[PDB]
PDB file of C-alpha atoms and ligand atoms in Angstrom:
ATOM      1  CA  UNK A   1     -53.802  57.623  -3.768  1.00  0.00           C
ATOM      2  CA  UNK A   2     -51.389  56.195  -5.828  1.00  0.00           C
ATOM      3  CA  UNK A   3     -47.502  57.372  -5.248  1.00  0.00           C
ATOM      4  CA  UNK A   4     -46.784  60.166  -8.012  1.00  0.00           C
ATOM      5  CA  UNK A   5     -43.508  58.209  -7.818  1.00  0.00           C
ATOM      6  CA  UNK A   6     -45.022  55.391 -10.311  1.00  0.00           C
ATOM      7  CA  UNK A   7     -45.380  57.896 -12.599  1.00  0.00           C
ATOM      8  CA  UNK A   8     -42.852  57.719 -15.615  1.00  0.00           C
ATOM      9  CA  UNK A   9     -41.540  55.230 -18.240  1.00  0.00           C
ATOM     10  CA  UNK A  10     -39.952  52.312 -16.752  1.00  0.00           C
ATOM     11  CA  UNK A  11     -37.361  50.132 -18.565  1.00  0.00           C
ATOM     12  CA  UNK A  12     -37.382  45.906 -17.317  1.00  0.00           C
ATOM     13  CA  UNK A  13     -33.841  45.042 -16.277  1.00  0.00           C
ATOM     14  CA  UNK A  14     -34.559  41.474 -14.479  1.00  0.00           C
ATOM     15  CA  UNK A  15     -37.077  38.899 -14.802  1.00  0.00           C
ATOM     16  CA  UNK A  16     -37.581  35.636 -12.685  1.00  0.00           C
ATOM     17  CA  UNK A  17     -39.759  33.011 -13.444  1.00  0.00           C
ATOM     18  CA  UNK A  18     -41.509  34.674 -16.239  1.00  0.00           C
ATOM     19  CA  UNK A  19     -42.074  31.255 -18.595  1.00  0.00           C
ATOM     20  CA  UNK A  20     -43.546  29.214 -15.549  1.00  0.00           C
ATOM     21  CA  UNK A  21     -45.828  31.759 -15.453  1.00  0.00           C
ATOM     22  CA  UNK A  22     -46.474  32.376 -18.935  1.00  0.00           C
ATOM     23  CA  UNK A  23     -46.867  28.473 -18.845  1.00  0.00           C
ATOM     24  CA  UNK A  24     -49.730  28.779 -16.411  1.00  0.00           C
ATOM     25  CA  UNK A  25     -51.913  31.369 -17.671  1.00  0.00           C
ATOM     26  CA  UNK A  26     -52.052  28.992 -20.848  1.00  0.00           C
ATOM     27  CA  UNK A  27     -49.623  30.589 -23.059  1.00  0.00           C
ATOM     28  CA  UNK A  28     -47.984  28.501 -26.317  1.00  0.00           C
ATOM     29  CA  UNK A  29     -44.543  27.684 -26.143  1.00  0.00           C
ATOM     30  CA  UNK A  30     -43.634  30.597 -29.481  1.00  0.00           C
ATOM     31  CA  UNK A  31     -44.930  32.853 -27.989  1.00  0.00           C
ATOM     32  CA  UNK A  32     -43.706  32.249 -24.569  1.00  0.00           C
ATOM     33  CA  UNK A  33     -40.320  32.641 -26.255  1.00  0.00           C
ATOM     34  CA  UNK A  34     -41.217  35.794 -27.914  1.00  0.00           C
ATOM     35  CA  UNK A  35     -42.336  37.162 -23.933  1.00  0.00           C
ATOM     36  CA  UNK A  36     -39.195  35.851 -22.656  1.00  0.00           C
ATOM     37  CA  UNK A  37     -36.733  37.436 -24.947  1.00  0.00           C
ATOM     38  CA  UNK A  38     -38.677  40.625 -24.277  1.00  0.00           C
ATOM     39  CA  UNK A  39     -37.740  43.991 -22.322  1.00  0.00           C
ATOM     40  CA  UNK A  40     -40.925  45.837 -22.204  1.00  0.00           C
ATOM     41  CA  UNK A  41     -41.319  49.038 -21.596  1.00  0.00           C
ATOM     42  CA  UNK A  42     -43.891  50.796 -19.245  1.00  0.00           C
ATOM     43  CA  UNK A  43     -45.665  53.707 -18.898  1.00  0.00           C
ATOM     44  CA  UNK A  44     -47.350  54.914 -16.340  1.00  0.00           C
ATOM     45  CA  UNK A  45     -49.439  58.099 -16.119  1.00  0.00           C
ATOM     46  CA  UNK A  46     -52.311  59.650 -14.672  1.00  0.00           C
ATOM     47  CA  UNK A  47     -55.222  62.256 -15.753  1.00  0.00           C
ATOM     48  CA  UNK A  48     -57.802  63.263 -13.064  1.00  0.00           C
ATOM     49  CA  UNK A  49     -58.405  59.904 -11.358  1.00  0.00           C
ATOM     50  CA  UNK A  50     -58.209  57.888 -14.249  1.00  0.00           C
ATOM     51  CA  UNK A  51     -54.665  55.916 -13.805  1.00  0.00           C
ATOM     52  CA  UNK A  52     -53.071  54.237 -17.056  1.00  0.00           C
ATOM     53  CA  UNK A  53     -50.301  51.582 -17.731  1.00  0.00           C
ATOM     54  CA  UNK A  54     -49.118  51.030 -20.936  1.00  0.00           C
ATOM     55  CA  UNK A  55     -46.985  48.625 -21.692  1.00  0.00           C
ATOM     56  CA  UNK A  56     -44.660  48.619 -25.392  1.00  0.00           C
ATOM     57  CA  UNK A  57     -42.709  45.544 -26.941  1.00  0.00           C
ATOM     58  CA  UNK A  58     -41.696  45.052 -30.137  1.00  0.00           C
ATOM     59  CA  UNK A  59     -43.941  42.057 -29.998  1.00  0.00           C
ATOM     60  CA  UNK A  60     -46.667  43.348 -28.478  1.00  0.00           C
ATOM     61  CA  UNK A  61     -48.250  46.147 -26.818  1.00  0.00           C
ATOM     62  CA  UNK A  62     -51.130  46.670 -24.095  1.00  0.00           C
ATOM     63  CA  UNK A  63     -52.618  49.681 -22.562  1.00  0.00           C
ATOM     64  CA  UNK A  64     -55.346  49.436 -19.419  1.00  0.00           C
ATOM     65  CA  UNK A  65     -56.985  52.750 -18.169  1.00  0.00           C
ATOM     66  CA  UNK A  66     -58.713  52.323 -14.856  1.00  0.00           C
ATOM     67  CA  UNK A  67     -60.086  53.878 -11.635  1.00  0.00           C
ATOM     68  CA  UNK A  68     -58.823  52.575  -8.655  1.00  0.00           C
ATOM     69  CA  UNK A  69     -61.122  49.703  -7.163  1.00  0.00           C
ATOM     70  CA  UNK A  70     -63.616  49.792 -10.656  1.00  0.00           C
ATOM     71  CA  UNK A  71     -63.413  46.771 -12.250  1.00  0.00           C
ATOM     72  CA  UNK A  72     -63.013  47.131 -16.264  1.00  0.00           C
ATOM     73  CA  UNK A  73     -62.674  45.085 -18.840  1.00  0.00           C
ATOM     74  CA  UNK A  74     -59.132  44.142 -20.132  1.00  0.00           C
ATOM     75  CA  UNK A  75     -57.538  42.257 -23.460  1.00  0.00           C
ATOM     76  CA  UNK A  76     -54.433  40.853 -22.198  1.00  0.00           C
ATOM     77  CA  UNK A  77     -50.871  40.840 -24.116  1.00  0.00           C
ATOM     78  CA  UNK A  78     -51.945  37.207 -24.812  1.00  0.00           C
ATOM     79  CA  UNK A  79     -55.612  38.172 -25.439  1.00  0.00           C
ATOM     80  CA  UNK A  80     -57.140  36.981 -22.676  1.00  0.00           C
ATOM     81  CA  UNK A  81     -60.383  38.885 -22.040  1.00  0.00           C
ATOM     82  CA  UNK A  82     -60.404  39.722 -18.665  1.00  0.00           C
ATOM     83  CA  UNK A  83     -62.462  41.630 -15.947  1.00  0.00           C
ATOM     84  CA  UNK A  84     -60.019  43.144 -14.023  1.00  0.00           C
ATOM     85  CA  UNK A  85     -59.580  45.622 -10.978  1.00  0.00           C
ATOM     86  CA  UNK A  86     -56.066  47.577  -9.631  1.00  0.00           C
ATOM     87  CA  UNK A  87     -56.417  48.284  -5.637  1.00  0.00           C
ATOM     88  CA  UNK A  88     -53.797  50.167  -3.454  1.00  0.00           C
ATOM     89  CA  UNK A  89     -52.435  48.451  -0.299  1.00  0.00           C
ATOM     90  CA  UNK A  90     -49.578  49.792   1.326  1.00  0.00           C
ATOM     91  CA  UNK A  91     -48.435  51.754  -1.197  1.00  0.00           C
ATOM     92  CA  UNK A  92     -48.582  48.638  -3.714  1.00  0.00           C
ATOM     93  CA  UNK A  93     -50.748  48.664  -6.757  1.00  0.00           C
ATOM     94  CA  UNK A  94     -52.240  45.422  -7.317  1.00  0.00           C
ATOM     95  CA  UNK A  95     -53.669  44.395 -10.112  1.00  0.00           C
ATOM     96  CA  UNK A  96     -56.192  41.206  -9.907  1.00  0.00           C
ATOM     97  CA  UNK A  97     -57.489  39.698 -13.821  1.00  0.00           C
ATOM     98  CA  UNK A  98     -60.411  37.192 -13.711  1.00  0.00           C
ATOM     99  CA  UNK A  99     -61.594  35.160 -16.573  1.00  0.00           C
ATOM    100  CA  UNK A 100     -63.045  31.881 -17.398  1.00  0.00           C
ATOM    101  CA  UNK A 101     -63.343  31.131 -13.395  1.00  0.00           C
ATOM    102  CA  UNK A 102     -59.415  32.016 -13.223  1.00  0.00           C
ATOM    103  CA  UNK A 103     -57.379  34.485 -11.352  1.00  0.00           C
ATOM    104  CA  UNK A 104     -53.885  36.204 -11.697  1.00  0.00           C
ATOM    105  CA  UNK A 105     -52.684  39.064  -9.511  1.00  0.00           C
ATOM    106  CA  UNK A 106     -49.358  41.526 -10.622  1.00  0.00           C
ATOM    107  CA  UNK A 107     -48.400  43.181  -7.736  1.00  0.00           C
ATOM    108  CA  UNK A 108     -46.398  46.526  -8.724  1.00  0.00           C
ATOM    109  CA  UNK A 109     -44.518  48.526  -5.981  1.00  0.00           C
ATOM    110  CA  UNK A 110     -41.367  51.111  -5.586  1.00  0.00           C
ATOM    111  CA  UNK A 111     -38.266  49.196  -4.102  1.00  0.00           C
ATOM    112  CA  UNK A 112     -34.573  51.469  -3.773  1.00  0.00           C
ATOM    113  CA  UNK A 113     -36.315  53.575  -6.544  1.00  0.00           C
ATOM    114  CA  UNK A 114     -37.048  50.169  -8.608  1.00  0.00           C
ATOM    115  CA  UNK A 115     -40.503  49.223  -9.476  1.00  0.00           C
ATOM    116  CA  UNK A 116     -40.806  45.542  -8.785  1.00  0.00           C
ATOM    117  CA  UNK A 117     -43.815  43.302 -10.585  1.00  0.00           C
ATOM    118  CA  UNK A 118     -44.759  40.375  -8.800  1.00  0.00           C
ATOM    119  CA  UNK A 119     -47.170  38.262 -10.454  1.00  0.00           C
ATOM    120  CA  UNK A 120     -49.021  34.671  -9.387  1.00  0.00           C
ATOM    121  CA  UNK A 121     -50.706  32.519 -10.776  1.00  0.00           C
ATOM    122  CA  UNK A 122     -51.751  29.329  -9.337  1.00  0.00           C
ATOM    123  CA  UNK A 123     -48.643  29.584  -6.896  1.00  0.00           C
ATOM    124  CA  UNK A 124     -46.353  30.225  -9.762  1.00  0.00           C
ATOM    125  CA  UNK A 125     -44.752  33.742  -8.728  1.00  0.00           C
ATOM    126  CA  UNK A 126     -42.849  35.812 -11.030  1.00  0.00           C
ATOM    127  CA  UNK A 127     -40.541  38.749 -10.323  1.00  0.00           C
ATOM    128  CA  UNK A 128     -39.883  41.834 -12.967  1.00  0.00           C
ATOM    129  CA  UNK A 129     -38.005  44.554 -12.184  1.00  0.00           C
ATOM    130  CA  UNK A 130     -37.913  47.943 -13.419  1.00  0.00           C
ATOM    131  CA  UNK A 131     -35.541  51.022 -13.873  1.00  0.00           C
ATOM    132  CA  UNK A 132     -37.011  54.204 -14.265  1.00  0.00           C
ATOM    133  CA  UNK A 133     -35.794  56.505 -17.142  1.00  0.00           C
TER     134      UNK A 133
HETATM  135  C1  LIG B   1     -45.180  41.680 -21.730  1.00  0.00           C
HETATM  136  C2  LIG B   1     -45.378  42.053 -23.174  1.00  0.00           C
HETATM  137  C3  LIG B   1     -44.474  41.254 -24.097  1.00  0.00           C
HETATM  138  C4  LIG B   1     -44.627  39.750 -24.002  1.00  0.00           C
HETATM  139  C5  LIG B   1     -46.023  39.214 -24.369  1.00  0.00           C
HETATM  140  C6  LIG B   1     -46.155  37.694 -24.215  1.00  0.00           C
HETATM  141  C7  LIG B   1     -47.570  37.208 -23.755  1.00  0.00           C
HETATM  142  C8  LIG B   1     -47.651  36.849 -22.260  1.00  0.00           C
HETATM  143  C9  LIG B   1     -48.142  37.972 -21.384  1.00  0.00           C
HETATM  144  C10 LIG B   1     -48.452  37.548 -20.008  1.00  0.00           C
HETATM  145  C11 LIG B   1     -48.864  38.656 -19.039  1.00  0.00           C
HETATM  146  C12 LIG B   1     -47.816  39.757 -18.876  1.00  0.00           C
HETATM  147  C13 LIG B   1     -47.612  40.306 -17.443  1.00  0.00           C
HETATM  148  C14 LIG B   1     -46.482  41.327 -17.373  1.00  0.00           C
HETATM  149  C15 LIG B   1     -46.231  41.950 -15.971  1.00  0.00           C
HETATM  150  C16 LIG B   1     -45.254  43.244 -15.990  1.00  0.00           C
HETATM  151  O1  LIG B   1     -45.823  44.345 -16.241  1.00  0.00           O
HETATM  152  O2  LIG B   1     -44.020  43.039 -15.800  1.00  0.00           O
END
């Protein structure tokens, strides 16, 4: 299953292309400015095989519990209401969010000890990375 090596609080310390994205999954420009001065912080942890990312900003914050390849229902950081599912392939946990006939995948694996987000949308790819603490 998932890498015990997710597990922890991870601290952003690089984003690329967040506002294009943001921009494509419909977001407003204030708020995209709130989500691009923004360092989240996540959390990721684990009871029995029920996996859960949390994610904590002072502007907003988001937890998802899930089984791995169960779809669940999700409310978004920007409220999108989504039906959701997180597979593992090749060590990477990807998460895929449908809704209103759309689709965005964040794609979260371990790089040098970093966890790197990659997330698309309609082509638009973003990069986050993490530090663990
Ligand atoms: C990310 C929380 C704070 C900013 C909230 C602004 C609303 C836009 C949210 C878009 C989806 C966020 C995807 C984040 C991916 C990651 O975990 O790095």
């Amino acid at each position: 299953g998932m890498s015990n090596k997710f597990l922890g609080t991870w601290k952003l310390v690089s984003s690329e292309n967040f506002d294009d994205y943001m921009k494509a999954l419909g977001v407003g420009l204030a708020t995209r400015k709130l989500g691009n001065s923004a360092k989240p912080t996540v959390i990721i942890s684990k009871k029995g095989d029920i996996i859960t990312i949390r994610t904590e900003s002072t502007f907003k914050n988001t937890e998802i519990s899930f089984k791995l390849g169960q779809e669940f229902e999700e409310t978004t950081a920007d409220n999108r209401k989504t039906k959701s599912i997180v597979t593992l392939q090749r060590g990477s946990l990807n998460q895929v969010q449908r809704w209103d006939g759309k689709e965005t995948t964040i794609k979260r694996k371990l790089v040098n000890g970093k966890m790197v987000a990659e997330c698309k949308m309609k082509g638009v790819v973003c990069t986050r990375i993490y530090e663990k603490v």
